[PDB]
Amino acid sequence: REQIEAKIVELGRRQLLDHGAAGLSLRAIARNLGMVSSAVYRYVSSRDELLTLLLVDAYSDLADTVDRARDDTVADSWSDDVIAIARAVRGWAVTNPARWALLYGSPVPGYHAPPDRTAGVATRVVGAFFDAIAAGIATGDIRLTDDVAPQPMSSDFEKIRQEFGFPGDDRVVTKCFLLWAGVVGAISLEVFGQYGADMLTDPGVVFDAQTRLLVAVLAEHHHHHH
Amino acid sequence: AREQIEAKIVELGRRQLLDHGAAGLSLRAIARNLGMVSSAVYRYVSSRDELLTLLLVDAYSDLADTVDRARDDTVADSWSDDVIAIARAVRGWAVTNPARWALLYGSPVPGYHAPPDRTAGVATRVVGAFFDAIAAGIATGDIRLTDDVAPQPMSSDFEKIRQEFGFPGDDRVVTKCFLLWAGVVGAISLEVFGQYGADMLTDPGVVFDAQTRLLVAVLAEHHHHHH
Ligand SMILES: CCCCCCCCCCCC(=O)OC(C)C
Ligand SMILES: [Mg+2]
Ligand SMILES: [Mg+2]
Ligand code: NI
Ligand code: NI
């Protein structure tokens, strides 16, 4: 089976590279497996199910890539950990541009990913960032200021904290959202070609410079609040 | 006479985006839903690529026009309020026009490359507005220029950017301009493309605005240290 479902995922991933989602076809996938259109449907019931399999696969590969890169190390500091994560995410997106598009690019209209399948893997990189930043809180380099956000943002953040076992207060969590948005934004601008013609000679150097600013956001205090 | 037909074609194209994305763009379907014949449509919009190009130009222009309107109702002391107002207007446009945002800043359309002679100008209008708001912060001294040089080749690339946008920054401020654009685009895309998920944030606009205020603090080096 999974030998079969594996091949489906591999095929579908190729159809993604070539035509994007529109061109997903349990029809093509069917021929290749020496199979009748109808035969495939037990393994993968529908175009949607294919899409969710392809999503879980991309998310997992990305997260495994990140996990691997953290196990590689200068354990020196939380900030070096954050940089290593960001660099791994970007490197993965640059090597897998169509799968980056799948994950963080345009939605497939008519498709809604059942969270029960996607939630877990979809938060593993987010989770890595939180884990990395939690180290900087435990060692005092990232100073909690007990600056409470208005509701309902504060209660939103409290759920997020509990989910991830993250000890950052409301300001740290705001800064984490900025970090993630900046990382995903920078990557997508590069990968999707949106800086355009002859603008950046080495987009990676610019990405690294952005990450360093985002680290400095986490490390310094911007309001008179003590 | 063409002009008015082209408009109904483009409006129906905007609808197909909403319903099928760039995939479902079809001049033939359009051609029907206007009680017209397929062969008649190519006379007004000659290909899928031309339809996409019209839809891109339309979207970039509407987005920029929305920014420009929001700035005209920031009547203010403040370069920072301007930056915040631009960012808010971009997000508002994107959430209200999510399929057109996808067309602009989402995944590339396989096989298609926008003609820079139709798209490049309008595509720089909002970036341009941010540089103009930020330049006012530099003029008043809230954003201080240094002689620090960004790591190469950034510094070299940045000189060409400052010239193109008539922006009187230094390297450091330009880096922070790239950060702001990335943060804005990135935050909007995560919300609009449905990564956040339904429940997580009660109003994502509120977190977004907090992020923009942090980006303003980065530009102005508004922080202190306990040394
Ligand atoms: C806060 C602003 C930061 C500025 C950095 C980004 C500038 C991106 C401009 C892209 C224009 C483009 O598409 O032109 C092509 C030739 C086609
Ligand atoms: Mg790929
Ligand atoms: Mg729309
Ligand atoms: Ni302080
Ligand atoms: Ni300082």
Curated annotation (Swiss-Prot), chain A:
Keywords: Cytoplasm, DNA-binding, Transcription, Transcription regulation. May participate in the regulatory network that controls the expression of MmpL lipid transporters. Its main location: cytoplasm. It comes from Mycobacterium tuberculosis (strain CDC 1551 / Oshkosh). PANTHER family: HTH-TYPE TRANSCRIPTIONAL REGULATOR RUTR, HTH-TYPE TRANSCRIPTIONAL REGULATOR RV1816. It comes from the Bacteria. Contains an N-terminal DNA-binding domain and a C-terminal ligand-binding regulatory domain. Transmembrane segments: none annotated. Homodimer. It is found in: Cytoplasm. GO terms for molecular function: DNA-binding transcription factor activity; transcription cis-regulatory region binding. GO terms for cellular component: cytoplasm. This is HTH-type transcriptional regulator MT1864. InterPro entries: Homeodomain-like_sf (IPR009057), HTH-type_TetR-like_transc_reg (IPR050109), HTH_TetR (IPR001647), MT1864/Rv1816-like_C (IPR025996), Tet_transcr_reg_TetR-rel_C_sf (IPR036271). Residues 2-62 form the HTH tetR-type domain. Residues 25-44 bind DNA.
From Swiss-Prot, chain B:
Contains an N-terminal DNA-binding domain and a C-terminal ligand-binding regulatory domain. May participate in the regulatory network that controls the expression of MmpL lipid transporters. Transmembrane segments: none annotated. One of its GO terms (cellular component) is cytoplasm. PANTHER family: HTH-TYPE TRANSCRIPTIONAL REGULATOR RUTR, HTH-TYPE TRANSCRIPTIONAL REGULATOR RV1816. Its main location: cytoplasm. Disulfide bonds: none annotated. This is HTH-type transcriptional regulator MT1864.
